[PDB]
Amino acid sequence: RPQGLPNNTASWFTALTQHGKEDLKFPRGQGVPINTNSSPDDQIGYYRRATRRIRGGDGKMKDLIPRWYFYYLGTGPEAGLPYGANKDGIIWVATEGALNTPKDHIGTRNPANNAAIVLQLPQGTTLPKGFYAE
Ligand SMILES: [Zn+2]
Ligand SMILES: [Zn+2]
């Protein structure tokens, strides 16, 4: 049963790192990163806390530090999750006027072709203390 290369698992944006002790959350209408090449319909998705698979020879540790990555709705590791679905490590965000449809046309990033774009939030967004974009 032939198998092709796995679908790209990288977020288009840099990490939102939890450098403090606050739990990640956003007010309703906030959280979606800036993407000038996306429509109002596309402004919806989730932050997913990065999980550990196979990075640890001497460590069996990686970076104890929590890192959260944004994925548009219907894309990434939780592509099959509907908006609002409750899961530890998933935070849902949506701008006003967003459409509840998969953003397959944006999809995910392939690191071998494109670099991550710096995660930027609109001016005056309420971000919890200790969270910083990388
Ligand atoms: Zn940092
Ligand atoms: Zn679009």
Numbering used by the authors: 41 to 174
Publication excerpt:
One central protein involved in the formation of regulatory ribonucleoprotein complexes (RNP) is the coronaviral structural protein nucleocapsid (N). N plays a major role in RNA genome replication, translation, and packaging and has further been found to interfere with host-integrated stress responses and stress granule formation. The N-NTD possesses a peculiar, hand-like three-dimensional fold, with a β-sheet palm and several flexible loops, arranged as fingers around the central β-sheet. The latter, together with the extraordinarily long basic β-hairpin finger, constitutes the positively charged primary RNA-binding surface.
We have recently reported that mutation of serine 105, located at the interface of the β-hairpin and the N-loop, to isoleucine, results in more sophisticated changes in the NTD RNA-binding behavior. Slightly more distant from the palm region, des_mutant S105I interferes with the ability of NTD to selectively recognize RNA target elements, likely caused by an impaired contact between β-hairpin residue S105 and the N-loop residue Q58. In contrast, the S105 mutation exhibits more local affects, comprising the β-hairpin and the N-loop, in line with the mutation site located outside the core network. Consequently, and different from Q58I, the melting temperature of S105I is not affected, but remains WT-like. To unravel the structural basis of network-disrupting mutations, we solved the 2.2 Å and 2.0 Å crystal structures of Q58I and S105I, respectively. The comparison of our WT structure to Q58I and S105I reveals a strongly deformed β-hairpin (basic finger) for both mutants. This is reflected by high RMSD values of 4.552 Å and 3.198 Å for Q58I and S105I with the WT, respectively. Most importantly, while we find the β-hairpin architecture to be significantly altered in both mutants, the core network remains intact in S105I. This observation fits the WT-like melting temperature observed for S105I. Our crystal structures of Q58I and S105I show a strongly impaired arrangement of the extruding basic finger and a loss of its β-hairpin character. Both mutants lack the capacity to specifically recognize target RNA yet retain the general capacity to bind RNA non-specifically.
